[PDB]
Write a protein that binds this ligand. Structure first.
Ligand code: ADP
Lengths: 532, 532
């Protein structure tokens, strides 16, 4: 058949390394036989063709100016203005490398947070600065060690791997390969998939990687590696090491507006066809964020502005009555549709014994509207919502703290023998480890016992102390972003976290009011309209 | 067939016993047809890889010296002088035996200690001592009995256990193999992999060690073993015999400075790419240690010093401003984050109703900030923290002591019928079982009932009696080190442990000022000094 001759002519001209030349000889030996009566060799032909187009002795060196590299990364989907410094930190590390040559010998980089952020655009900016050919292969669709490796040409089911797929359509021997959804691979075949992942991620062992489908070494040392994380608590332990975690949660109103004005909306109208006949203002984006998408990231905003751009394209195609289409938070029902959420979510007829608190999930922050039913009984505790045991410990701690004050809060003679508690949480299984809303449901119980109207729009995070203290907590930036996105402008935090606030985005501080407390007494006094 | 030729020679020059030569020749016939002719060809090739690439009859020169190893322990590490002596004991015992004498009933080392306290480093120092190759193999994350061994050698697609590949890595029969994290071995399969590790970790049976993948009982008699274990409680009893425990608790603050100055700081400086143009004062080292790390050892220190090196890569890369830049304690947050830990615990401003306990949690030493409350009720004790009932017993013992000693603490003569005690313990459970914090709870309850603040700068440990007589407690060194790593240098100890003040090195008693007590009266005299 002409296939053998074509493959021989494709192999015999490309300059190839000796071991890979011998592997090409092996594959050419396989394809000696018929390629039409047995399709088990056609996939070998596809693998060879992907291997033929692998670049060799041709690479794009990075720009040696770290300052110019930062200048190029300044267009990485706007980043966060506080996460880019660690990226360019690793880049500067890559400017005084070990042995004065291109090699990692260290954790490379990672993006942790909600999937809606611009994970791919930042890697594209990295490639643009470094001049290498960007490419990505998603590992979320890979659940077995058979799509980064293969299945040797001796039985049916030898589909090509994703590694050579990235190696195929690339012009540089050292590309940047992005691996999204790294926290969903389980054990299905050939043991733990993370073992091969850590074998690849090694800067010295990647060159010594022999797949299930390959029998010779393959050059991967200089190839830059990059991954993306969604939930840090699900990634396998052999993947938590040799990995510099860069916390990149969602964006504020101002960050999202800048992304839309610089990266999102022009690209969306690129995807929708024509340009110069639509316009999106800051007020429209703010209203959409505050009324249509409360999640974290811009992918939902990507879809929304894509819908708006497609609509405007249809309006222009059906008749150009206006030079450009503008949205000013008044004609948005035609552009997008009926609103789904409620602006100012705290404006839900504030009841007597309910409080609101932050609970930053890795997919997006939420407000915990925990209600406490202080029915007059003889002392009971009904804890619903599937809440963790630490949440119950925090609840009992709040109970005894409220016990510590008899008549200060206008409480009755007793409630341990007179009040039955039925505490409900919108989702008790809080992904945030430890007590995330202990002070919140403490305030809820106090309101249910004092029986006075409570303040809304103040979302909280932290825990209580039996003598009236609050301890500092980690991940305050993510919860502050959750409050900013969820229409919350007042946040109560412990004093001890304030020293950590000098490394936060200025837009978060501008958009939020922070009133610090040291004791549960203050946070209880400032959340009920009357002190008693 | 070139592959068949290569496999045939690989059989030839490698010297296996004729019992294995029989298997080699019995697998020779399985390669009488090409790869696609039968999948048995691929599994035969894989088995030949697992057999004739694993070394046979090859041994590195064993070193049999015993003060040279003292130098090596001093060359690489700053010096333990407690663990080092016991390693000398084991090595000397191995030296006087292990010739032609079948006396190998000796236990295999287990280096029980928190993560990053000098175990793998100690392992590689030991390996260099006898000129043996080191291959860490982390067993953490293994729950399958057949992950240690192989599987059926009847189909292609399966790999042997960790041992076969791990010793395939080395080219000699006798490398040091540091088994790791043996405590997290769970049984999520048929039986417990504890026996699958006992068959290899005992010299009398692993000399004929058998795995599923291989059909020959391999000889592991000559292979040194050494096992890391963050926990001793969860080590299986079948794997607890023939075990000698070499405790390695955490380091000390001045030892931390010394290890940073001697090896850690130069290590990370050459790691980043810097070669002697950065100066770091000891004050900056201590600031890093006591403000940015609370883990026992150097792992956190390794990360922080890597951060220092990378920010130095910043501030020397863009120009050689200075020949030797000096970092004091003032500019350490210019290179790092905000100080996330306090300098010293003396600034705690003693709180009314809390006591500072001591324990050795197998992830690293830590305080037990046990807190309690005094609500006016009818008299009832409530444990909170999901600890054992033994802590409730200790609390009741302390309550009885106060009842018998009410004249000494100003309480009303009858409080057992008026106060309800909520003993909130922060952690879920403590490893150092029993009333290992009995005097801590005595202090906490005494402070709560009397409303007298307790000094939150003195870390303590010791049991109590129902009449009140503190008792000896095991692991006094553990409690002292846990107190030291909390920035605490004043410790209350039971006077019956006065014998446990000389066996400890002077490398631990630097700033710790032990104030021994024999009765609860003295330990409550040290703390409940203020009376507002
Ligand atoms: N004397 C020492 N004390 C503490 N750490 C040391 C010492 N010497 C070297 N180290 C470093 O500590 C690191 C941690 O190793 P080790 O604690 O032995 O293993 P693990 O981190 O698994 O407990 C090693 O990489 C080593 O470079």
């Amino acid at each position: 058949l002409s296939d053998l001759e074509a493959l021989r002519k494709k192999i015999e001209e490309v300059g190839m390394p000796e071991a890979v030349k011998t592997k090409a000889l092996k594959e050419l030996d396989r394809l000696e036989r018929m390629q039409q009566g047995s399709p088990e060799a056609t996939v070998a032909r596809t693998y060879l063709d992907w291997l033929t187009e692998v670049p060799w002795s041709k690479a794009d060196p990075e720009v040696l100016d770290i300052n110019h590299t930062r200048q190029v990364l300044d267009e990485d989907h706007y980043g966060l203005k506080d996460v880019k410094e660690r990226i360019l930190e690793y880049l500067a590390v890559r400017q005084l490398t070990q042995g004065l040559d291109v090699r990692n010998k260290a954790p490379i980089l990672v993006l942790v947070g909600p999937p809606g952020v611009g994970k791919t655009s930042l890697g594209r900016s990295i490639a643009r600065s470094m001049n290498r050919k960007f490419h990505r292969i998603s590992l979320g669709g890979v659940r077995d060690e058979a799509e980064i490796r293969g299945h040797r040409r001796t039985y049916i089911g030898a589909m090509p791997g994703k590694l050579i797929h990235a190696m195929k359509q690339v012009g540089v021997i050292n590309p940047v390969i992005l691996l999204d959804e790294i926290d969903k691979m389980s054990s299905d075949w050939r043991g733990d998939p993370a073992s091969a992942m850590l074998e690849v991620l090694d800067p010295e062992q990647n060159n010594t990687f022999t797949d299930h489908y390959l029998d010779v070494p393959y050059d991967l040392s200089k190839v830059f590696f990059i991954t993306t994380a969604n939930t840090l608590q699900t990634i396998p332990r052999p993947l938590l090491d040799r990995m510099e975690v860069i916390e990149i949660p969602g964006y504020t109103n101002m960050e999202k507006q800048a992304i839309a004005r610089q990266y999102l909306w022009p690209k969306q109208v690129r995807e929708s066809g024509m340009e110069g006949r639509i316009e999106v203002t800051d007020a429209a984006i703010l209203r959409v964020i505050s009324e249509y998408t409360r999640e974290a990231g811009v992918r939902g905003l990507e879809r929304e502005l894509g819908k708006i751009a497609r609509k405007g394209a249809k309006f222009w195609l059906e008749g150009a009555w206006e030079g450009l289409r503008t949205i000013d938070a008044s004609d948005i029902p035609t552009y997008l549709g009926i609103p789904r959420y409620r602006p100012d979510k705290a404006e839900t007829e504030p009841q007597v014994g309910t409080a609101q608190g932050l609970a930053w999930t890795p997919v997006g922050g939420t407000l915990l509207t925990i209600e406490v039913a202080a029915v007059p009984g003889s002392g009971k505790l009904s804890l619903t919502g599937q809440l963790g045991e630490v949440m119950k410990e925090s609840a009992q701690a709040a109970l005894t703290y409220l016990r510590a004050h008899t008549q200060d809060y206008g409480l009755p003679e007793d409630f341990y023998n007179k009040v039955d508690l039925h505490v409900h949480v919108p989702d008790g299984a809080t992904p945030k480890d430890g007590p995330s809303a202990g002070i919140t449901m403490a305030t809820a119980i106090a309101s249910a016992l004092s029986r006075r109207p409570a303040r809304m729009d103040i979302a909280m995070t932290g825990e209580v102390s039996l003598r009236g203290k609050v301890m500092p907590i980690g991940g305050v930036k993510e919860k502050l972003l959750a409050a900013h996105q969820a229409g919350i402008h007042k946040i109560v935090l412990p004093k001890d976290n304030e020293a950590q606030l000098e490394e936060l985005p200025k837009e978060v501080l501008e958009g939020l009011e922070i009133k610090l407390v040291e004791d549960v007494g203050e946070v209880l006094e400032y959340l009920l309209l009357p002190e008693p």
